[PDB]
Amino acid sequence: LINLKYSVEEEQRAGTVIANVAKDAREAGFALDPRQASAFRVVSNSAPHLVDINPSSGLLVTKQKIDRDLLCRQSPKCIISLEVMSSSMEICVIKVEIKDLNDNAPSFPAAQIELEISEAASPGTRIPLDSAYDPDSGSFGVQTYELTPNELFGLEIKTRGDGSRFAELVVEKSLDRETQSHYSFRITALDGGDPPRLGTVGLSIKVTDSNDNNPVFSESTYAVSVPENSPPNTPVIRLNASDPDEGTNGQVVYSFYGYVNDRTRELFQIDPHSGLVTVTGALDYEEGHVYELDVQAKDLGPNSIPAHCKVTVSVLDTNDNPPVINLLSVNSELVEVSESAPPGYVIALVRVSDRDSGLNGRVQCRLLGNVPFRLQEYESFSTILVDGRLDREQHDQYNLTIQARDGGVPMLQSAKSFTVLITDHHHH
Amino acid sequence: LINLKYSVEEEQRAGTVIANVAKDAREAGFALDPRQASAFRVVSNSAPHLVDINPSSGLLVTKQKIDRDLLCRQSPKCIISLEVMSSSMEICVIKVEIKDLNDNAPSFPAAQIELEISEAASPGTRIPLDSAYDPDSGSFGVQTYELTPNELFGLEIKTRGDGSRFAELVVEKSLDRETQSHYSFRITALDGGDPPRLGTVGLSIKVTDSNDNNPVFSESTYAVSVPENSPPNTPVIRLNASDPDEGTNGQVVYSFYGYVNDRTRELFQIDPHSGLVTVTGALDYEEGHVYELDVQAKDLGPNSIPAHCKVTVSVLDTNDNPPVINLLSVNSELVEVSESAPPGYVIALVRVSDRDSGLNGRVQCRLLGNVPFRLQEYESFSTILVDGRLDREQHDQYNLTIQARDGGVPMLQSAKSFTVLITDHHHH
Numbered sequence A, B: 001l002i003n004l005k006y007s008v009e010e011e012q013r014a015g016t017v018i019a020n021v022a023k024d025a026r027e028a029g030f031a032l033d034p035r036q037a038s039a040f041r042v043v044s045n046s047a048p049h050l051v052d053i054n055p056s057s058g059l060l061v062t063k064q065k066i067d068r069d070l071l072c073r074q075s076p077k078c079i080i081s082l083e084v085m086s087s088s089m090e091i092c093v094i095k096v097e098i099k100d101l102n103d104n105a106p107s108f109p110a111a112q113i114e115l116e117i118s119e120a121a122s123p124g125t126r127i128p129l130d131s132a133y134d135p136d137s138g139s140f141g142v143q144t145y146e147l148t149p150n151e152l153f154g155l156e157i158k159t160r161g162d163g164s165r166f167a168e169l170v171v172e173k174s175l176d177r178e179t180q181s182h183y184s185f186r187i188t189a190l191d192g193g194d195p196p197r198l199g200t201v202g203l204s205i206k207v208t209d210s211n212d213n214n215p216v217f218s219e220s221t222y223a224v225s226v227p228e229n230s231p232p233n234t235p236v237i238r239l240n241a242s243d244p245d246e247g248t249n250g251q252v253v254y255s256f257y258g259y260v261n262d263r264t265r266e267l268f269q270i271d272p273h274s275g276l277v278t279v280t281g282a283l284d285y286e287e288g289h290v291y292e293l294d295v296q297a298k299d300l301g302p303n304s305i306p307a308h309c310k311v312t313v314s315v316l317d318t319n320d321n322p323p324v325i326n327l328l329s330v331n332s333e334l335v336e337v338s339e340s341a342p343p344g345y346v347i348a349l350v351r352v353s354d355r356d357s358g359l360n361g362r363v364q365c366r367l368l369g370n371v372p373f374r375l376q377e378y379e380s381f382s383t384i385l386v387d388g389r390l391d392r393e394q395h396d397q398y399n400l401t402i403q404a405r406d407g408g409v410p411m412l413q414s415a416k417s418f419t420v421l422i423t424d425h426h427h428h
């Protein structure tokens, strides 16, 4: 029947006087018989330990200090319903409202918020953040959030229901670890207070890597030279591909990328994890001058995009073949010369070869001894001719010996000995 | 001394007359005397089994059919140097060159060329392709390559080592497996002849996957309701994230996200590999009405961009609290009523509550027995009043029993019995 409303701020000194219920009850129509200061008693009340009416004085006192933010959380109104009974079965419902105060500033449970975002995070990617804690009601509760001004990240606030706000992170534009790996920001939450209260958190963003870089060689093509007969495990060329990715994604492994049936496979090797290309087989300039290696560098991660380069290994000619002498008699027989052989008569023809090339293969010849014969060398063919008088007695037979010498370093020689004999007049 | 150069095509019939060595040499100055088949002899020649000069006739004839592509491979020139010696130690060097013919068409050894390219292949990255095989020399060897006209891939021709033509593949525009995984193209090799000869092979291109799709929920937020006291392991909600990637990259694993020290953690659980959110603890509407679950779906593998959604799980109120009856007398004494009690005089006040809500919390009261008393209902307080004649003798004491019943399903009752006594004059 009878209703009395009141209101008082929260967190007030315990034992506060809200109002004299006797005054406003009599004024409003109560059966307060003169009954030794005990006319009415509280039937039941929402908060036994917080508010109490005095049967003696007939006054509303706060039993303890009121913390509205615990009773009603964010509920818009905070009323303690308290019902009193009179001496003769009469009732007065009394509803006291607890006005909220901005005694709480928004709070973050974590001192810092560390996050990991892949550099491949599409712009628009959003990450829900732990909303701050402000137990005040509505207006005095958390209202907005702010992040350190930047271009890469933004904050978007949404209200699930009846405010109760939370704010998520948003990648605003493309990230890239290889440019900036870490970010450090500051988030502050703000409540709707006359002098608004704030909370703070440090926001560390570690940009997780993505295998978005492929190995790359300094050059597409290379050219190397190797002297023939280079011993096994001789350094040909050490390739250096670069991958700026992180860990496995940035680790390069070299290997050969060609068909597997060619001589190259057997001749050379590569150190896959280091990049050293060495000679393992028989390299002979005389057999082949050049070899083509197709090397691929590959990263150890997902979406492994390999990169290739071609190395032209030219073999170099060392002077490792002696000059070969070959005597040519007309009838492949013992060289006989007549005594009366006029100066300059040809005896036998000589030919020299050399499997090398250049100055290593080019030859020059000599005729040893004091013998009466000269060796005039012609283009690629040295001829022996008679020089002097031939006496059957003073010299019946000679043992001509030809030397051949190349122009390599170290130079090489060769010797060939053939016997010549002198005749009177033989018609064989 | 004397040089005679000649030329002849390959693959000619056997016993061909290249040139008349006797005539050419004699005109060129050589010991051509009329002798019994003994004017000169071939000293040595590059290929004995291929070409030979005969002193009897004096002609440069070929022994068999010559295949230049075997002798000199791609070597630019193919010369056979025959050395001839005359009667009087005179020499005529002869070099016969073998002109190449397009008797070989370029051919590929494999039927198809299998390739694997990551959909993340940046436009411009190239994959060296296996060069075709044509043993002809220079112009007549492999010259250019051609692929099926398309937009995604192109061909690039390059020259590595003094010829040795090769063509690598080049990506023209971005690939995407989630749109098209396999490609079927045709490559043809061509040689440099008037009627060019070709070879062909099928080129299968498999687009290897890249984790370039993140899990995605159907909607941004969800809302579900669950009756309180739902037993452990009850279906709350079935989340369903989608990821079109391949294998691991497309496999979603759901899990809980948010602050760790939260009530929710103990109440619910989620099936990580399936996405079923089941209840683990006891839910009580009377304690809390709503709960906020933050679920994240993330794919296994690299560059895991997770997706989040918020589930607002609202609890439902079951009628699981009985209506509490509570009678309160003036001084909490045995209820005494005066004999001369006029109809409608108040005896004792009743108050009933119910911790439930809605019709589950709404109560209605009853008075049992034939007793001379009424229970007239007020808002929140049922009053007991006198309705009959109170005779000390006919009825000295009553044992009034009040029932209370809520409007839930199944409805709940409660009973409270107090004794009333009748008296004429009270002096205390």
Ligand SMILES: *[C@@H]1O[C@H](CO[C@@H]2O[C@@H](C)[C@@H](O)[C@@H](O)[C@@H]2O)[C@@H](O[C@@H]2O[C@H](CO)[C@@H](O[C@@H]3O[C@H](CO)[C@@H](O)[C@H](O)[C@@H]3O)[C@H](O)[C@H]2NC(C)=O)[C@H](O)[C@H]1NC(C)=O
Pocket (backbone or CB within 6 Å): A399, A400, A401, A415, A417, A419
């Ligand atoms: C025709 O003449 C040559 C030249 O021999 C020499 O002529 C002079 C220039 C002096 O050097 C003399 O000492 C000698 O006769 C003969 O060639 C040489 O033949 C000798 C004997 O056969 C070879 O001796 C050998 O040498 C090797 C190492 O060089 C030793 O290991 C052997 O044990 C042995 O002593 C010699 O190598 C060879 N060449 C040279 C440059 O000395 C040739 O034999 C001769 N022919 C005839 C038919 O008389």
Ligand SMILES: *[C@@H]1O[C@H](CO[C@@H]2O[C@@H](C)[C@@H](O)[C@@H](O)[C@@H]2O)[C@@H](O)[C@H](O)[C@H]1NC(C)=O
Pocket (backbone or CB within 6 Å): B368, B369, B399, B400, B401, B417
């Ligand atoms: C007072 O009465 C209580 C209820 O008894 C009930 O009486 C009728 C109306 C039915 O509801 C019947 O089912 C019950 O027996 C008793 O339980 C109680 O004992 C009585 N008081 C005393 C002091 O005995």
Ligand SMILES: *[C@@H]1O[C@H](CO)[C@@H](O)[C@H](O)[C@H]1NC(C)=O
Pocket (backbone or CB within 6 Å): A239, A240, A274, A275
């Ligand atoms: C590759 O080159 C870079 C740049 O000069 C250098 O820092 C790095 O040490 C080189 N690595 C190898 C393996 O040569």
Ligand SMILES: *[C@@H]1O[C@H](CO)[C@@H](O)[C@H](O)[C@H]1NC(C)=O
Pocket (backbone or CB within 6 Å): B240
């Ligand atoms: C998710 O929903 C799709 C329909 O869009 C369905 O094909 C798929 O099977 C569902 N996922 C699971 C795990 O059942």
Ligand SMILES: [Ca+2]
Pocket (backbone or CB within 6 Å): A010, A011, A066, A067, A068, A069, A070, A103
């Ligand atoms: Ca407070």
Ligand SMILES: [Ca+2]
Pocket (backbone or CB within 6 Å): A010, A068, A069, A100, A101, A102, A103, A104, A135, A136, A137
């Ligand atoms: Ca407050």
Ligand SMILES: [Ca+2]
Pocket (backbone or CB within 6 Å): A102, A103, A104, A105, A106, A134, A135, A136, A140, A141, A142, A191, A192, A193, A197
């Ligand atoms: Ca606040």
Ligand SMILES: [Ca+2]
Pocket (backbone or CB within 6 Å): A119, A176, A177, A178, A212, A213
């Ligand atoms: Ca990058």
Ligand SMILES: [Ca+2]
Pocket (backbone or CB within 6 Å): A119, A177, A178, A209, A210, A211, A212, A213, A244, A245, A246
């Ligand atoms: Ca990277």
Ligand SMILES: [Ca+2]
Pocket (backbone or CB within 6 Å): A211, A212, A213, A214, A215, A243, A244, A245, A249, A250, A251, A299, A300, A301
């Ligand atoms: Ca990489």
Ligand SMILES: [Ca+2]
Pocket (backbone or CB within 6 Å): A228, A284, A285, A286, A320, A321
């Ligand atoms: Ca050699």
Ligand SMILES: [Ca+2]
Pocket (backbone or CB within 6 Å): A228, A285, A286, A317, A318, A319, A320, A321, A355, A356, A357, A360
């Ligand atoms: Ca050599």
Ligand SMILES: [Ca+2]
Pocket (backbone or CB within 6 Å): A319, A320, A321, A322, A323, A354, A355, A356, A360, A361, A362, A406, A407, A408, A412
């Ligand atoms: Ca030499």
Ligand SMILES: [Ca+2]
Pocket (backbone or CB within 6 Å): B010, B011, B067, B068, B069, B070, B103, B104
């Ligand atoms: Ca041929």
Ligand SMILES: [Ca+2]
Pocket (backbone or CB within 6 Å): B010, B068, B069, B100, B101, B102, B103, B104, B135, B136, B137
């Ligand atoms: Ca040919």
Ligand SMILES: [Ca+2]
Pocket (backbone or CB within 6 Å): B102, B103, B104, B105, B106, B134, B136, B140, B141, B142, B191, B192, B197
């Ligand atoms: Ca050809």
